[PDB]
Amino acid sequence: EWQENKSWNAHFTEHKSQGVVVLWNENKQQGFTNNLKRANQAFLPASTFKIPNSLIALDLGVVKDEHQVFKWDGQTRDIATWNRDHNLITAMKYSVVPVYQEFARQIGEARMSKMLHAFDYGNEDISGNVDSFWLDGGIRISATEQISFLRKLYHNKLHVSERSQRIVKQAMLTEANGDYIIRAKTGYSTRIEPKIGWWVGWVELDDNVWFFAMNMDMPTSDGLGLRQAITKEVLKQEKIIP
Numbered sequence: 083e084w085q086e087n088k089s090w091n092a093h094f095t096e097h098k099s100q101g102v103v104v105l106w107n108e109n110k111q112q113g114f115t116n117n118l119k120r121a122n123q124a125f126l127p128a129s130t131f132k133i134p135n136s137l138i139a140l141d142l143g144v145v146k147d148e149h150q151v152f153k154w155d156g157q158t159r160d161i162a163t164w165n166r167d168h169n170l171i172t173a174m175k176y177s178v179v180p181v182y183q184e185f186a187r188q189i190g191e192a193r194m195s196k197m198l199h200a201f202d203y204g205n206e207d208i209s210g211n212v213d214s215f216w217l218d219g220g221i222r223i224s225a226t227e228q229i230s231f232l233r234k235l236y237h238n239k240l241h242v243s244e245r246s247q248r249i250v251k252q253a254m255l256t257e258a259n260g261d262y263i264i265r266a267k268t269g270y271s272t273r274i275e276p277k278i279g280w281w282v283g284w285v286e287l288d289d290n291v292w293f294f295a296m297n298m299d300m301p302t303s304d305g306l307g308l309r310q311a312i313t314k315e316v317l318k319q320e321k322i323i324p
């Protein structure tokens with residue numbers, strides 16, 4: 083069911099960091115992690131909320147499809163990639179917060195709450211600003227809850243149209259080669275302590291899918307690449323990827 087392998091802690095220790103990687107074998111219905119305590123420790127989802135946010139916007143028509151353009155609002159922000167026009171694909175790719183803040187306001191406080199209950203998403207608490215609760219509000223989710231949510235999305239079992247779920251999984255596309263496909267979303271929570279990085283998603287193989295969910299303490303932006311680098315070192319160790 084759930085087995086803990088502390089050997090993976092080296093991958094966090096080698097970099098003087100702390101965090102958890104959670105893997106779920108879909109064929110075997112078996113989970114694996116380095117720290118079962120942290121695996122269930124709930125944090126702010128931050129930009130990982132793009133996934134449910136994207137799903138909700140699409141299903142209500144706030145976003146019509148992955149080609150619709152969302153014009154830069156002309157306010158120059160500290161991240162250049164945000165200072166341009168975007169569609170759902172590029173908005174997800176560059177974690178464009180201002181676009182999803184506009185989604186949330188159009189979704190509305192009421193509808194956002196029901197959908198997150200329908201999704202059984204985390205603590206289902208949207209306390210705070212409707213356009214920032216996933217960055218500095220009351221919502222919390224753990225790695226194992228992320229994986230559980232992702233599993234429904236993969237299997238099109240969330241209570242939104244199949245189309246909306248297919249479109250988001252398209253937007254989640256991160257890496258694809260002859261060996262595997264990764265559909266995932268990054269997260270960086272800085273507005274409330276502790277500062278952490280997220281990476282959640284799954285690795286599609288020919289005959290199996292490995293869902294993953296990782297977070298780690300993130301005092302400075304210098305270690306943002308360790309989110310994927312540590313996850314991939316674990317996937318290699320377990321011969322999930324070469």
Ligand SMILES: O=C(O)c1cccc(-c2ccc(O)cc2)c1
Binds near residue numbers: 129175268270303306
């Ligand atoms: O999580 C990602 O992949 C991603 C993408 C674009 C920008 C940022 C980011 C945001 C804020 C920051 O202070 C440092 C980095 C993260």
